[PDB]
Design a protein around this ligand. Structure first.
Ligand code: HEM
Ligand code: HEM
Ligand SMILES: [Cl-]
Ligand SMILES: [Cl-]
Ligand code: NA
Ligand code: NA
Lengths: 713, 713
């Protein structure tokens, strides 16, 4: 059946903005997962999970009689898809249970792991999400095997369809670099936003880069991909060596014995995949990655044996029974237990990427320190495990249940608690009048609030105006934020703030975070008045100001908007067309297509463009809140053509005279070209639509202003 | 970016069930288009459209100084995509303005026609939909040129994204038959549900079948496609000759001059396409189809000159300036006006498909009668034009405005007026108790009501339980409806009805249509009580009973369910797997994926299967409304394998013992296989889900019962 994507494979895709509708959700529209979770008997769930660890099922027998290593890998892979570049992936949506991740080659046999958990899921129902369950199971696996975890938070609501993520452009699973759709160019430079070396891997190839078994070059891939997952060297070594303290890999026979992944399997497979024709196809005969490595002498118990083995032997390159590259300890005795036959022991083995932790010089120093100081290792691994499995959960306000660690961690972008009365409505009116009396213009107030609030992304719930980080490094210096203009607004607002706060009684004070937002609201009000409309814009106080010391400058860098169509900004030339980057930003903002449309057309007329660019400013009454963008964009009296200087800038001329009326970019003109966007623009450009436009603009403006307000959840 | 559809191109696509979300709709959740339309000054809109007909724009100059022919073609094409097989296509959703239909080669230059109407659309805003405006414009065209239309109804609400329609499997526009994705097999048998001879055409190729200019063979393709659009020979001849009374074709130069269709065009083309390098690119130089024919001596005035020319000349095969096959009158004088140069005239010309109306012997008889009696022609054309443009609008209850024709037409599947008091809540309770006391079983009652209500399709708003047509030919004899069992139920209900209605005063009576639905409601309540749960199922009276004489038996044939997964029914073996046909049915029923899931699982345990098949009946308490379908389907204690006799029937055995527990079809087991469906089944299969399951089942049951209830809109 031929589709629109077949005929016009490059047209923009707006269905990414309309996922996750109430239509696909089986829960009623008022269901609140946090409320369900908070009444869960978490202790009961944990007891059942502890029981499960050693309850072997014959359709996928437990190695060593204990599923803990399998479950650790399952939770690690749940979390492991995370990319800092866009915040997409991670554990927080339970996406391992849907395509494509349920069928990635690196997730082979995790279908079995998930299926082992169905009885517990069934028993507790909506009070524990799959998303929470995968991580809690990993925690219980660790605790069961003698490792004390740093804590756990619930609150990951389940989702009900696949998330739209760019995972790469290869058309072949596990394609090595340099193909027609390579993710690598130059000196092994991985394309942003990707954080894995091959399509269908988590981070790196366990055999080495492009299959070449060099530990030193593998380390370079490890460092790069883990950094793209928000992890530094100490965290990386702790996580790899911690995880590989447990369990084993599976490669008992040739890979050609393994059949179709879950999404390809027949209907009778009932959602499982990778059925194997090798011997019994399971247990002792399992094939998952094709590697056959068991790291420690006690694979079901926390130990310090990983680093003892890593440093205590020299290593020889060998092949598994499936033909994959791996390492075996020279001259060792058979000291590692077999998973099924108590009469069999094996020599210590390692992956190429495990050897990276000894042969990369920076990792070697950490590894040695961990070998010499095992308590350091344990604490680092516990902290890293917590970070790995919570890094996409957002502010601490979203963390639920009795095991949330009290310690505030820098990567959580912490926001101080408020410990004073908040401004009320009379105070808000007094502050908005002060702001408008200061001389700050509508363009300045809207631009500033926009810059502050629009760093939010719903993928990992980072960013937003809470914290007033716009005033700190690095946000204060981002080009899109117009650092010189920004500084002047902030000084004026800080003086208003100081004067208001110094006049108060009791402890009442306004934060700068709240004042930035409220000043934006006053801008919008003023713009509506400029257009002859009375409009009140809603404002909710309660934001606090974070410090520079609470603000990791290197972690904040990934929030920098290099493309922000809402301010007609593009920091450089990119291969993806600007209108696709606009839709991508709208998705991170949680906007629908109508919301993106209304928002952009209003911002253009309020003066929110970077540098005061006239591109898309289709009005003769700038700083007035009108639907002029739409009415003028849709006027067939104007003809548009690209400029000779720049094919991405367009000139709009009177059709009859030739006279220049406007200029615009691709992000402006898409609204007149894309047949779905244009249908939305037509609603707002109609004669009956001015009041609708104003009211829909205020609603979407407020939405953006509140995106990070989980304190009001 | 590689997508799930790239990796698994045959997996089932559930996003067809989740279109039209409140996310994508720019109007607020409370917008009601009928309430807007009812206050539109339709007379004023028509005056504006009348003026537009002779107000030429220089970017697309009006042939003859009159846009009427262009607008008639536009309205005809808006309607002309309709297929009776599934009800999909037609003018009722305004889909011409979205992909793919906006860019079909047969719709070339209708982009210009729609753009001409933006000022009016803009002026009247949400009070007239695009969908209604396209049709209205064609009526105003006709009226402006001296033709009396049959009437007009508003009420077609606009849509905001493309509909999911199977238009064929070809990957090339206008592909000739016999390719690797041919839509023809056997002796020129067009595959169902398609109603056009090539991809991107409306009905037929104007040059002849596969480009062969034989009018006799063309006539076969005309008859077949028009019948697949619900039009008979009289109506077909009336429509083709009626439409070709007006305007002209456009083929002034070679087609290689014409550029990209709108969806492929550059951003600067602002939604238009087919830009032409031939001379001025427009007006006297226009190229649309590549044909260059002007049919009558007065292309801007209704006449009977089409038939005067068709029968008063002999015709010679010729070529247009673009090389297309067309016909010219032998020996004729230059009597046809030129569209722009008042000093130039031309000989009469015709398409191959126009000549079909004289050289097909059946058409020739109708065409001669129309030639001799042009008043017969005018009335047939007006009736056909109304039917064409309204055929997908649904029951007459949906028809809005002051020009609705009072004549009731058989093709409307008309429902008599109700002229008596309706039953109240106490009456409904009395009737449900009588029905249950009669001995009719839960399975009988549920199956009967399901059979009656589930003929609805949202594509053209035909079918449903209103009318009690289940008791008439042909519904009473459809295999899926189990004719002998259905007859026994209907006799019992008719006796209850007679007794209740004979006891009343005051003229209160209950229709059989209502009692069929009410009795199904009693069954569902009884099933709930069998499970230990008291629930009330909502019921809304006001359906009426249609007669046999008010029922077109041949038009009702396309509503027969040949595949109904909700009753585990497949009338024969099809190319398309049964789970794909289930999703197709659910889309016609307007169900989401959660709604489809709940409904199916509940119908399985109520005894709704055709023939009392055990397939999918995963319960030991049949006729009790429980979630047993889901709990048993999801039990990993059961292993599934296809049977040797039939690869589409599966046995479920105990994994440990081999003992046979169940049988199922593809439609049952897809809920345990597809990863999104399985996620939904898991919710309803959980230990906390009995209350939810019952509530959600009752709600979707009531939804299905009420699909055709536009009297309650
Ligand atoms: C450079 C990074 C890493 C690579 C290349 C890697 C590679 C793999 C491979 C190839 C397997 C075998 C799959 C199979 O055949 O069953 C595996 C197993 C496993 N990995 Fe990793 N791993 C990495 C990091 C991690 C991390 C960070 C953790 C957790 C903290 C982890 C925990 C596990 C465990 C527990 C197993 C054993 C599974 C079982 O017992 O069934 N690994 N690793
Ligand atoms: C066998 C069925 C039919 C065929 C093959 C056919 C074919 C065409 C073609 C090839 C064009 C020329 C497009 C262009 O070059 O501008 C056209 C024009 C047109 N057709 Fe048809 N047609 C059919 C039925 C109808 C029907 C049912 C009507 C309306 C009742 C209709 C009304 C028109 C009008 C009014 C024009 C002139 C457009 C103008 O003036 O711009 N046609 N036809
Ligand atoms: Cl994601
Ligand atoms: Cl459609
Ligand atoms: Na994420
Ligand atoms: Na339709």
């Amino acid at each position: 059946g031929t589709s629109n994507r077949d005929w016009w494979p490059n047209q923009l895709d707006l269905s990414i903005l309309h996922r996750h509708s109430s239509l696909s959700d089986p829960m009623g529209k008022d269901f609140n997962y946090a409320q369900a979770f908070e009444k869960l008997d978490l202790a009961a769930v944990k007891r059942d999970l502890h029981a499960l660890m050693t309850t072997s099922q014959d359709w996928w027998p437990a190695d060593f009689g204990h599923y803990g290593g399998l479950f650790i890998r399952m939770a690690w892979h749940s979390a492991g898809t995370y990319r800092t570049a866009d915040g997409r992936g991670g554990a927080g949506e339970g996406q391992q249970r849907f395509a494509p991740l349920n069928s990635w080659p690196a997730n082979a046999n995790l279908d079995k792991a998930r299926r082992l958990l169905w009885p517990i899921k069934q028993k507790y129902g909506r009070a524990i999400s799959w998303a929470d369950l995968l991580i809690l199971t990993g925690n219980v696996a660790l605790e069961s095997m003698g490792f004390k975890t740093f804590g756990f938070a619930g609150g990951r609501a389940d989702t009900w369809e696949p998330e739209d993520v760019y995972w790469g452009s290869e058309k072949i699973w596990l394609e090595l670099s340099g193909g027609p759709n390579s993710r690598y160019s130059g000196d092994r430079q991985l394309e942003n936003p990707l954080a894995a070396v091959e399509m269908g891997l988590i981070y790196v190839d366990p055999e080495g880069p492009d299959g070449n078994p060099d530990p030193v070059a593998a380390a370079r891939d490890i460092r790069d991909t883990f950094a793209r997952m928000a992890m530094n060297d100490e965290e990386t070594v702790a996580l790899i060596a911690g995880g590989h303290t447990f369990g084993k890999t599976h490669g008992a026979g040739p890979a050609s014995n393994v059949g179709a992944e879950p999404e390809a399997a027949g209907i009778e497979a009932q959602g499982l995949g990778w059925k194997s024709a090798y011997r019994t196809g399971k247990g002792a005969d399992a094939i998952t990655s094709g590697l056959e490595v068991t790291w420690t002498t006690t694979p079901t118990q926390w130990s310090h044996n990983f680093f003892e083995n890593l440093f205590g032997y020299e290593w020889e390159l060998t092949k598994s029974p499936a033909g994959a590259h791996q390492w075996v300890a020279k001259g060792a005795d058979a000291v590692i237990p077999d998973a099924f036959d108590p009469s069999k022991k094996h020599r210590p083995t390692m992956l190429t990427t495990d050897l990276s932790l000894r042969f990369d010089p920076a990792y070697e120093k950490i590894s040695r320190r961990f070998h010499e100081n095992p308590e350091q290792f344990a604490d680092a691994f516990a902290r890293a495990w917590f970070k790995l499995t919570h890094r996409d959960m957002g502010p601490r306000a979203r963390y639920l249940g009795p095991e949330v660690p009290a310690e505030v961690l820098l990567w959580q972008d912490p926001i101080p608690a408020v410990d004073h009365p908040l401004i009320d409505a009379a105070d808000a009116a007094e502050l908005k009048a002060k702001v408008l009396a200061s001389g700050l213009t509508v363009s300045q107030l809207v631009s500033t609030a926009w810059a502050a609030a629009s760093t939010f992304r719903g993928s990992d719930k980072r960013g937003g105006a809470n914290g007033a980080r716009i005033r700190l490094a690095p946000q204060k210096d981002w080009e899109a934020n117009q650092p010189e203009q920004l500084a002047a607004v902030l000084e004026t607002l800080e003086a208003i703030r100081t004067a208001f706060n110094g006049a108060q009684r009791g402890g009442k004070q306004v934060s700068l975070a709240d004042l930035i937002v409220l000043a934006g609201c006053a801008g919008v009000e003023q713009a509506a008045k400029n257009a002859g409309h009375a409009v009140t814009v809603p404002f909710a106080p309660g934001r606090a100001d974070a410090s520079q010391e609470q603000t990791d400058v290197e972690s904040m860098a990934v929030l920098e908007p290099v493309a922000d169509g809402f301010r007609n900004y593009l920091k450089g030339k990119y291969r993806v067309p600007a209108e696709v980057l606009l839709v991508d930003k709208a998705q991170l903002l949680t906007l629908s297509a109508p919301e993106m449309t209304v928002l952009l057309g209003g911002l253009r007329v309020l003066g929110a463009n970077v540098g005061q660019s006239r591109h898309g400013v289709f009005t003769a009454r700038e700083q007035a809140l009108t639907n002029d963008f739409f009415v003028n964009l849709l006027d067939m009296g104007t003809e548009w053509k690209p400029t000779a200087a720049d094919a991405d800038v367009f000139e709009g001329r009177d059709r009859a005279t030739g006279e220049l009326k406007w200029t615009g970019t691709r992000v402006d003109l898409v609204f007149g070209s894309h047949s779905q966007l244009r249908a939305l623009a037509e609603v707002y450009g109609s004669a009956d639509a001015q009041e609708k436009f104003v009211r829909d603009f205020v609603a979407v403006w407020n939405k953006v202003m509140n995106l990070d307000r989980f304190d009001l959840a």
